[PDB]
Every structure is written in C-alpha cells, then in structure tokens.
Amino acid sequence: PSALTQPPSASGSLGQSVTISCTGTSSDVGGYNYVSWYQQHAGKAPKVIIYEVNKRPSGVPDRFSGSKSGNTASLTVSGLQAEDEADYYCSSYEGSDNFVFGTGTKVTVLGQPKANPTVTLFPPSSEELQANKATLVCLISDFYPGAVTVAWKADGSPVKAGVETTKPSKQSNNKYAASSYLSLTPEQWKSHRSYSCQVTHEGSTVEKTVAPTECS
Amino acid sequence: PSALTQPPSASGSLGQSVTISCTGTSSDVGGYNYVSWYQQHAGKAPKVIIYEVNKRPSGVPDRFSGSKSGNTASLTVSGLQAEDEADYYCSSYEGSDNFVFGTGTKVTVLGQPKANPTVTLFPPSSEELQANKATLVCLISDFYPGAVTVAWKADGSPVKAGVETTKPSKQSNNKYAASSYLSLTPEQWKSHRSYSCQVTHEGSTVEKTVAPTECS
C-alpha cells in the first residue's frame, strides 16, 4: 500500500465551516480506530490536534472536531477562524507497529480583510559602516494578500543592481513579511542625496525614503 | 511541554553520512524511549522512517539508523542518497494528549560550497522613534544550505514575544537570505542595555548586539 486519501483543498469562509475527509481502507480505517490529524503551517512542524478518532490534546481549540464512518474519517472545522490556514493530515495504524498518512489538505479560508503593508526603511548604521559596509533594508510587513513589488530609487531614478527581495512569509496572521535589501559601499551611500523604497501592493503604492541625514 | 530541539540544517554530499539530532526539554526523556523520526519531501508524504528510538518499519532502508541512548535522538543517514533530501522531524509522546514534535531538520545535499550567514542587525531608526515606533530588524544573508534558527535576546534573556521571521528565499548568487524583526515601544527599547539577534546555521552561530542611544 502507501496512502490514505484526502482532497487538496478546503475553502471555508469565516463561520461557513469546513470538514475534511480521510479515507484509507478496512485494513487501517475500519480496522482500528486511530485516525490522527496533524496541522503544519507553511514550512512548520505538526501539532497533533486529533488522535484516537476524536480526542484532542491539552491545547487544541474547542472547534476542531472529527468524525469517522467506516473508512471515511473526517476533520470538522467549526466555523473557521482563518488563523488556521495550514496543511492538515490524517493517519492510521495498520498494526505491525506501522502507521500510514493522508495525502494532506490545504485549507484556504476567505473573508480575511485585506491589509496594506507597514513599510519601514532603515539606515545602514555606525558599526556596519565602521567596517566600510552599507546595507539598506526595506521591511515590508503585515499585508494580506501576499503580493507586493519592491522597487528602489537611487535618488529619483531606478535601481536594480544591488537588490535582493525575499518572498513574503506568513506571520502569526495571514499577514506576510517581505524584506528587500540594497547593498552598497560608503562611497555609494555618501555619493547620494537620498534612497527610496517603493512597495506597490494591490493598487496602493507606498514609498519610504532614507535621507542620509540622521544620526550614526 | 511543547519543544524538542532539532538543528536547523543537516547537509552532506552523495555518500557522506549525515547525523540529525533531537535533544529536548530534559524533564522527561530516559524513562521515555518512544521517540519517533519522521520524513517528508517537497509537499509529498510525511512518512515515518523510525519509531521507538531505533526501529525501522517496513519499506524503509537500514541506511536510516536510530539511537536515543544518551538523552538525544540521533537519526543517521549512513551513505547519503539523492532522494534523501527532506525535512526530518523527531517527536515524543508525553501523556495521551501530548505528542510533541521536534523543530525539524531540513537535509540538503550540498549543491554548492557552504555559506555561513551574514547577520546584520539594525537598530530603530531616528524617524521611527519620531513616530513612536520601535522596530529592530535582523537581516540574514548569503547562506547555504538555506536553513537557519533565529533567536532574539534582551540583556541576557530570550525575547520570545514580538518576534517574526521570513522564509529563506533564493537569491541571484544562488545563496539565500531571510530576516527577523521585533516590535517594541520606544520605552521597551530604551529601558535595556542591549538587544541581540543570534542566528544559528548548522553549528556556526552569530550573535549581534544593538544598544540603544539617543541619536540626538
């Protein structure tokens, strides 16, 4: 064998509710009563949320439930609260001290209000410079959905060269963070009037400009 | 209890022998010989590769070895194969509703020369302070394999609350970058000697401090 069987998705809006299927066979689900359910957030470790058919750990939200019907076990998400955008997983014992898992389910919930990104620009710093080094960082955060562009403006003019823009990571919110840097020399940073970070998210353009004029 | 400490990155070449550790919160383990090691690929099946500290299941190579004698689980991939790239996890069963996962090691087959990260910590900008905002950022770049652990400390003690980290994005030079941040009140900021960001990569660690000043 190899698998249990799950749907790739599960769209349930705030309240509206969700429910997952876990199906294997008699040999595992129908035989035995040991469907488990683990959740893994984008590149995170599992929390064990259900074990022994419908029992929950000490610190599993009240609204995660489960069911089973012969071969068709199931997770129920009592009225979605968006935080729970994850990857779910089922699993069942097959005796011989071996367990086999579900293919997984991404649960994308809509009705999360849309957020515009708290953009911060940074100055290099005293130390960073004591070494003859100058990175500027543009910190883009707490936006949803996770689509931004990040431009830099060497004075009123564009710059590509020394950019490196990460791709947005989910926070503890369906809010993202997407940090881009420009890495120049002191001789680059002082041979210049200003430097501006431009972050176009979903129609809204935000631009922050670091003028050398500040402290250390 | 919730945490079993697993490295950030375990790297080897084809035929080399990678060793992955799982140490954990001490007040347990020893009269606890139920530690299981899991395996998963690019969103493709979170299999169990070891159970009961040393026991392989069926359809698993003896290339995977397991040990706990000590107070640390060690999974040894002896003779590194290609398809062995994955995010390894250990776990351990407490009470019937306590199933704690390890932080989980991404295992790479070094596809480049290794890059220990460059930690560059920024203090709160002059202006952000002028806004009554306190963002101190930890920029992490030019690393490979793209696995890090990031802690924050304030004056000795770890800063748990207010932390948020990015996902290690691929960059042009074929190294990677990430970023953390912490969000304070100006007060929070100034009532403290130093804030350090310390980032672990394999078994190189950097720890970089940022002390508050008046700027003005």
Which residues have CB under 8 Å from A137's CB, separation 6+?
A121, A122, A179, A180, A181, B120, B122, B137, B139, B179
Q: 3-state DSSP call for residue B53?
A: helix
- Do B82 and B128 fall within a single domain? no
| Angle made by CA atoms A179, B178, B21, in degrees to the nearest 5 | 160
Whose tokens are 């953390």? That residue is: B180
Contact (CB<8Å) B128/A120: yes
Q: Do residue B164 and residue A178 have CB atoms under 8 angstroms apart?
A: no
DSSP state of B118: E
**Interchain contact, B167 vs A58, CB within 8 Å:** no
What is the Cα–Cα distance from B35 to B32, expressed in whole angstroms?
Answer: 8
State the CB neighbour count (10 A cutoff) for residue A90: 28
Least CB-CB distance to A46: which of B58, B101, B177? B101
For residues A89 and A127, membership in a common domain is answered with no
Does one domain contain both B4 and B62?
Answer: yes
B73 in the same domain as B144: no
In chain A, what's the furthest Cα-to-Cα distance? 74
A74/A118 same-domain check: no
Helix (H) or strand (E) holding A129: helix A126-130
Q: Residue A59's domain is classified under what CATH number?
A: 2.60.40.10
Q: Are residues A102 and A125 in the same domain?
A: no
- CA atoms of A191 and A186, how far apart (whole Å): 8
Q: Which residues of A touch B102 (CB under 8 A)?
A: 45
Cα→Cα distances B155→B125, B182, B193, B215, Å? 20, 15, 6, 20
* B169 interaction partners in chain A (CB closer than 8 Å): 165-167
Q: Which residues of B149-184 are buried (b: 16+ CB within 10 A; e: fewer)?
A: bbbbebeeeebeeebbbbbbbebeeebbbbbbbbbb
All residues of chain B having their beta carbon less than 8 Å from the beta carbon of residue A40 are 46
Domain boundary among B111, B128, B144: B111
**Structure token pair of residue B70:** 């000590």
Same domain, yes or no: B9 and B83 = yes
Q: Which of A62, A90, A111 is the last residue of a domain?
A: A111
DSSP-derived secondary structure for A168-185: PEEESEEEEE--EEEEE-
Question: Last residue of a domain, which of A85, A111, A137?
Answer: A111
Cα separation of the two ends of chain B = 46
Q: Are residues A102 and A148 both part of a single domain?
A: no
Flag if B120 and A128 touch (Cβ within 8 Å): yes
User: What tokens were used for A54?
Assistant: 């419908």
- If one counts the domains in chain A, the total is 2
Give the domain extent around B143: 112-212
Minimal CA–CA distance to B66: which of B34, B31, B27, B98?
A: B34
Nearest to A135 among B43, B55, B139 (CB): B139
B54 CB neighbours in chain A (<8 A) are none
Q: Are B136 and B121 in contact (CB under 8 A)?
A: yes
Q: Are residues A78 and A126 in the same domain?
A: no
Is residue B13 located within the same domain as residue B103?
yes
Kindly state whether residues A104 and A172 are assigned to the same domain. no
Q: How was this structure determined?
A: X-ray
Cis before residue B61, ω within 30 degrees of 0?
A: no
Q: Report the C-alpha gap between B39 and B100 in whole angstroms.
A: 15
CB contact under 8 A, A167 and B167: yes
Nearest Cα residue to B92 out of B160, B193, B23: B23
Task: With CB atoms and an 8 Å threshold, state whether A40 touches B57.
Answer: no
Contacts of B135 in chain A (CB under 8 A): 120, 139
Cα–Cα distance measured from residue B216 to residue B214, given in angstroms and rounded to the nearest whole number? 5
On whether both B203 and B185 belong to a single domain, the answer is yes
